[model samples]
Target: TKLLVSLKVLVIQLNPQIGQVDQTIKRTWSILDKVTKSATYVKPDIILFPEFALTGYSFHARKDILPYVTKKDEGPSFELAKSISEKFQCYTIIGYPEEDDEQKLYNSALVVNPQGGQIFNYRKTFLYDTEMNWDCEENPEGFQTFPMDFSKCAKLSNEDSYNRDVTLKASIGISMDLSPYKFMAPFNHFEFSSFCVDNNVELILCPMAWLNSTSITDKQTLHNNSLLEAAKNKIAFALKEQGLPLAGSQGIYQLKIGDSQRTPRVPSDDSTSEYKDMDEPDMSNVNYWILRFFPFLYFKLRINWFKNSSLIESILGKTRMPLDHEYYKKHKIDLLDSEEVIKDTVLEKTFLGTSLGQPWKFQGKNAILVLANRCGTEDGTTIFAGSSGIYKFNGKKSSLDSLNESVELLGNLGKGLEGAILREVQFEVFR
Candidate 1:
């Protein structure tokens, strides 16, 4: 028997106060609490926070941010996350600064379950130049998974309940882990896609602090660059190869230096401030975008049995047959009431059509891929063009034309410092 599992995922995109651990944690909890009480009642199975969300990027020096880094088990940030999980009774995946026994710091992400336990922790294996100053030592355990039992949370109203036991295999990847080829360029190789395929991973949770150019005049150019990088890198390549679904945060946070008291600051000043601005550090940025890909692949099977005397006859005649042992014992076979196998024994392998394709025609196994972003003009300057939509990948042999035709718009997040995106996806799995 087989059943379908519906999982709701939430991606939080916000600007955390750079190097302000307490402020960041408080803001995170506020956002979570607000969303849970929304009119629609946003109850997601898992909530994903952006990379380095607790201790923001753009640190001045290793010594400046060293005090902010703490071990996974002994940290205010992790403790707050555990409390959040216990309160909501849901899973949370968040990124922070981690320190091991040797005191080596690494950018890491932790998975907190509803029971207030840290189920998994992964340090960022792919480090950017900006992170090299303080974030040392890459995570040797590249990718990891924690079992997620959704049987109790899944609704069975429209699904077969004969075999309801199911677990979702969830994998995590930090910012640059998705596209290792960026550093190892000229080689043009991608390892994350192969990793997903090899591990039979179904869901990919990515925590990213992706940035973009700040020039208002170059908004389009910035967007193109971001889209090109994403499409050519891990997300796009991974879909073509394995068709797994991924969800990540999208936004850029600026780091400001000095205080208003140091310089003569004007009230309600927007253009300039007293703070000394260091070199602007930009992570890969684009308008807020949420991208998801779903490949609809289903399988059907039928089992047949044989009777005693006929089985002996076939054995004597030296005939080969597929065997079943429900009624037979020892070395003896039972085939006296053997019946001819028929094609009608199992339903034809087919693909259930979605809004993107024809219902009568089999599009083979398909994937529903989606990307949603916050776009539009902010403060009289065009921030991002806002390219957000859903896409379908119709199996391995499908052409680019069919894949392009399956794209549909899902609205954008527009411009803002605070916002959230929610996606609910349902798929079937064999028991």
Candidate 2:
């Protein structure tokens, strides 16, 4: 055809317990029945499944769940879904864990075509820290765009028309926990989303398991912001921010449409949105107030601290931190480049202190070291404003000039360090 246009897509947001293959498949069948029947008259060209949809997430030391994880092309789960595609004569996209011939498990996703078979296989590039404990591997090959048949664009002529070849672009695996710590997370969403648009990939799906942090308020904020990010980026994103218990329950979501105006996409608003009428949010309980602010504060910190002012600016004043990327480049520094000013230095420990100048309040090995480049500051000339040097327990705090030098250290410093850079520079953990 003459450069096929856009195709309408369905984004499924669900939560399935890890290792519950039987239950998951059963639930999926129910979902497929509902969606397929409803879409029977006006069948959707393709259905987008949430990340880790096929098999339940194996969170708690569940490597045995490997055999239960289906492959992209073969396996009962794949075949069952494939039959659904052929029977319904509709394309489908779903997330499933996969194992290669090498026996390495991958958080993988796939797109199924009515006649074409499996169209694309996407392996998650970023593996979360918790995921690291599992038998999974990171996709070193980076992002990909598979060309799909967009002939389905003609089906829109009839609201009931469904059977048509469709084009889809998708990515597997999204962890907010992993994103805040890693550099690739932020760029992948914006850059990859743009890349999809540039390459004519109509739909972009992020199969993510955004965990609820200790702070419930942070969790809600992240959930809403993720959707907002989808809206701002102009891509439809479905997330399973809640667990399986809330899967059937319709929850209230505050989606900011344009500018500051927010419209509630509540299940109660649309009877079809949720399985049941959502209970009125109980603001009466003091503890419930905490839940309301969860999503709000998360977005607030994400936008204000992480994205806007950044790690350095938030801690050190704007006058002390580098303003922009170019300013950082010109100054030969970064926000998390601790080793830059303090080379070959072992970071003994870190502590939460009162201000820039205070005792090294050791908050265990997990304490973060924020390094600020003062070269762009008013006083200008490369200076480490924040915690950038190695600390000795009983030993005196040595100046930056004392550490040894190495080229490998310098190269790492050049890689841009917004996230945690110094992995394990500790010489010893004192008693």
Candidate 3:
């Protein structure tokens, strides 16, 4: 068998609502038809859909989402995957809620072959808090991997002579699984990145519903829209005794009020209220925390690279890298550089005094990751981050580089109110 050279992948990012499973499935098929059957006729080798792409992800209890929970090889989502895989002649993958004979629910992902056969059925290893509310069970088997054969694809050339017959190692991670375990784990632990390297995972598929507080992603807008609403609601409740109306005022979305000792001055006409400092994604408007990762990555690498190599460094005796205590308050992911920054927080042993740096696992092993996240709002509040694209660390540069830049490849819905993004991307393993 010959090793595969390249792959054509398509990710379908849909905006789904609770109790809208049928409608979302219909819409997904419509998108599939348009993207694959267009004049260009993109015959992709694999396709992926966002987490809970068919059923919306805003359930508070089992009954709320029980009807939409799918069985092993049944349900509308399975039918959709079967049809797509058979018709498009490609491997299909999609995330959904699963129910076993015991009636236990879990967040799951299903993979089907081009001939409409089940290959991989993976349960989410890490449950997002929302899933916990509905009592969703974590995967008992831990992370999963399946052998993907190129022979399943429909006739491209001959019977097996010039066929891309090599088997590909593929793994799936749904949404929060990519984050450090429960967000309290060490940053350099690099959960998903480590798994990819240990298994030599080449075709990595991550179907996510990750949220971003802002729309523009190239340079992240440092604000949490959810925090702004929470603060507004708190103020609105406090003013109820004063016989005031709802806090939907023009400047209400930018309140920087403190919960400690603060009085909210209501705008009785054209009067202006103090705006909050939205320079970061913080749950607290009064004190913003920078949960932004892209800039943090660049700051750690680009910023540190200059200061470490520059002749000016010796002049300023080894003071810690900037942004240790103030402004950038620590999150679990911040542990990526905890060893290099703070003396406390107990750094991950693998990261201490090593040139490995952050995300070094993927760089050292040479693997490709295609993370496809959804766009649009879930329920009415949780906004789905839509920057679905490809990433690589095994390159000339070890930095986690996003490869989808073309108009057709980067159809992300970063901060849009409502819409879908269809991304068709290409990657080559051989030159």
Candidate 4:
């Protein structure tokens, strides 16, 4: 017997305000109702919501920041979205502000089904220092995905029961709007790929808000580029996949402009008709609110360790650490210090250390090794030297031993501090 398979995905381009969860829900319901009405035609099986659609991004604006914020687990807004999924007998993706049970607010996304909801809570990891005012978490981790079977909605010929079942998962994926921000782009791509590869995500949904007063041309470019990326990636990706289908609500191959309020200037009459002429004001110019902050909001939702790049440079003098002994002796510390002494001053916590001067094993999926100089450099000369290396989790237990590397040769002590530099190092214990 021969069987065929197919998938139907939808993208929802929504304009959402921050802190307005109730209205956001209403808006979602309205949009979903309309989408369901149209579903009679294309019959989409899955829907996605743009990032933070429940909360309008105002950056520093108070009102725009209000509606979307809510407790993560049992918020009324989430409950409403969940109900809609059940009633519509469809899968939905939602973007909203979430406060965990402990009352910590996070920029998060939700995947709702008839049974319940799966959540991918992304704590804005790349917030600029100025954005610290808002309560958010740093989700170094990225997006998630799940399988869903809409067999109940529409039946396929000779489909297996296993293929009929779908699992919905949550992950923090990439946001196209924020792609230009180079500092966070690497981390974003890394985490995104890691999430997809680890979860074996076959279908991906992206709910997004494209600000920047995107013109028709800009929107078109964004849409086309996105589709290309989706097709190339193994996962079938849908952007803004739910709650809205028409009026450019779903699969908007272009950027969109929602409702706008216009304020017109007074125009004076100036007629050259055998009568007195009065000054004619310029009525040609009308001002309306241009949404240019969505991209910025998206930017704020990623990691920003580079925020201290300048300050770090000023303190440490440079970014990269000198790896030679000349630099080490100037700093006054030797590389082969015992685990105890390393823990006492330079190292914060020991995930792994060795008593036999051999490589120690750390009991964590991830570890950060900071190489610091116990002494300061003198006259820019080099001093101490030692060997250092790392291993990783790529199914191969590889070893890197830079036997007798130089510290002073690397120049300056602060340059030695590296974040997760030992990420690739594998020890015997883990095996």
Candidate 5:
């Protein structure tokens, strides 16, 4: 059975301070209240919060964070999820630390339904070094794929012509699941992206606490070339007064000192700040990286995944899948790293496969990755890359032989949705 329906999804990119769960929850409530009270508010079918939504990351040890962990089902975090789900009449997915009967703690994501019931709990399979410090266990239960019924949440056509039975295959992955396992394994390990494809997942909801792609370690690497100019001016001034003009054809470096062309690049460009200003970017809106950000590349970052390989060509050959546009390129592919935007793409030529396309797509459909990530820093130190959304198969336009380009990102977050983003995705049901 199949049903053509639409769904509304909201991804909340939260910044939870260490040991300040109370304030964080209050802030979250405030944000939610604003969203609801607004005239433009359209109730969502699914709402998502980043990993460790209520609790802060960067806890020192196990017992240090145990105070905030949920002992049973009844806790502040659970209550929040329940209230939100009940009030909005939507499915809510949030990440929290869980403590089992034996006192073993695990990094978990809990899914609450419209009826305010805890439907599913997924323990994180991959643990980062920070998690291991607190002894959060690996997910004994691997990635979970279940059917989400959105009958009530569906965009109804008419009262007489009601089509309520709408359901889609849904899956969940926390921060680190999208990339390679612990980043040590091969690039493609049949992880979350592949799992969603294999299971024919229609709705992929990732509540991530991911960092920006590149960390910009050395100042000389790129941007704000203030160092070169400062040194250049100093050298030029020194040669101007001295008679040590060695007669040598130094090309551009020929020591005429008087010729403006001979001088190093004038501080003409907008990079007039001091050489040490690498930490402080003049344009804060565009250069969004925080001070302590370290380049996580493809790991904690959603990963361009295509940044390496035959360099891509070689990877394409190995995987063997035969693998979009301007508005899509700028908004989707270009903003692929931006946290607030929702972008869609077909799983092109290669990744994690001796048999590439087979692993990510089904018999005939081309797997589409629609992702929405979170922006800014969770722990004041490290920044997360936001651009988030969905991952599904597009079989509409191009058919089975070629790639499908018809799938679209229905709705995106508006201006006020800085921390929270609501995106609508239309999915065809498969029962």
Candidate 6:
């Protein structure tokens, strides 16, 4: 006997010009105004903006952008966000650069409650040194979880009993913080998702300024290797293993460099055709000696090197076991022989009757997932893959079929890249 409750979430995928702090904040407010004024949509309970939404990320020197960075309580951007949150009576999470009184800079996110109060300030833990010059502290304060209660929405007395204490936990992650593969040594360890499971987190709010080239291709070649797809797969697998949900933005940003007269292009479609053409070289016209000998020698040495390398075994063998399997082993919960034992364990009791039971069913659980992205022209190119949507999962069937059957699209996909779209999500809570 549990009650049903609904929570509306708004995700804004925005494109901010580099160093244009005031303009970006103005644009953000314009988008917010439209969404809140919509008569057809429910008022959002929470709204999320992408990483560095107020000030763009590509700065050649620290001095160039330091003027725009300010503390959470002092910045004009934070002031507008607080006003918006209070006016709309919705929680708001916005990404921006922060400058402390000591002049230390960090990529940070600010969370404002509906009462116009700052609730949390999180700095990005992972940093890409070559791309980002910002400093990240060693052993920085790890991921944080916030509990959101929806007991006030329950209707009946019996329903109230089940939903009164029901709380959803949310965690925040920046762009590369969710990468599956680690470039450093001992690369097999997973980061964000493992932290989520360890902390019993249910929803992840990731604000990203993910680039198409970095997301879809590895270094050195234009081969169809997609890191984003890998990251998404890893995230989905982790969530399914723990029976949780996550939502985030999918925007891309590009910077203007020296003497580049061309404007950024927005693609017509997000297809492999373009990359396929780039990957194929003209082998027909190449000199036989250079082509044949170079490729043969390179492959021979690389193959042998990889086969006999200790690095291969260390990285591959350690990650062969699934993350949850390792968790089960470490905690001494046997999936095959310890159902009763697991039933008494904390992990089992946490996700009980959801999907952690025998054969994995989706009964007595409910969740929602939201994804939004911005699409636009960068250097006169047409890059067309900004998609925004929502998925609902209600514990109804023998299997978790609601995930595939209950997807709904928000807005016009890639047509309006920087616009804000709102959607309402309703689900039941069974105890």
- lDDT tens string, model 1, 95-114? 88888898788888888887
Per-model TM values vs. the true structure: 0.58, 0.46, 0.62, 0.42, 0.62, 0.60
Best by lDDT, which number? 3
The sequence of per-residue lDDT tens digits that candidate 6 reaches over residues 1-431 is: 75565666677767665655777677776776665556555667777777777666555567766777889776876887798788878778888778777777777778888888888887776665423544433214544567665434444444533334356776777765555423452232445544544354545576665444313233432233364445445444432443323221222222111111211212233342221221121112111111111111112133334345423322222322234321233311334344454333333221112113222123334545444334332222112223333334343331111112222222222322465556555566544
| Candidate numbers sorted by TM-score from highest down | 3, 5, 6, 1, 2, 4
Q: List lDDT for all candidates, in order.
A: 0.46, 0.35, 0.52, 0.32, 0.51, 0.48
RMSD of 5: 17.3
lDDT of 4: 0.32
Candidate 3: count of backbone clashes, pairs at least 3 residues apart or interchain: 0
For 248-350, candidate 3 gives per-residue lDDT tens digits of 1111111111112111212122211122221211122101111111221122243354335432222122112112322123222243334555332122212
**Sliding window of 10 residues with minimal summed lDDT for model 6:** 289-298
Residue 280 lDDT in candidate 2: 19
Per-residue lDDT over 1-431 for candidate 4, one digit per residue giving the tens place of the 0 to 100 score? 22232334444444333344566556556655555444233444455554565544434533334454676556664676577666655566666666666755556666676566653344433333223346455443323344454453222354443253323333333233123222343322233323332333333343333221111223344359675444323111111132221111211212111111111222222321111111111111000000111110112211232232322222222111122212232232333434434332222111112112112112122211111111101111111110111111121111111111110111111111110010111111111
Predicted model with the maximum TM-score: 3
- Model 2, 1-431: lDDT tens per residue? 22223333343444345445676566556654554444122444555454565555534444566556665788855776588678756566666777777777777777787673887787776566445557576554544556555454533433454444444343332332124224443321232322322232333344444331111223343358665343322211111232212222222111111111111211212222221112211111111111211211111122233333333332332121113312233222343545555322112111112112222222121111111110000011111111111111111211111121100011011111111111121111211
Better of 3 and 6 by TM-score: 3
Prediction 3 global C-alpha lDDT: 0.52
lDDT of 6 at 82: 94
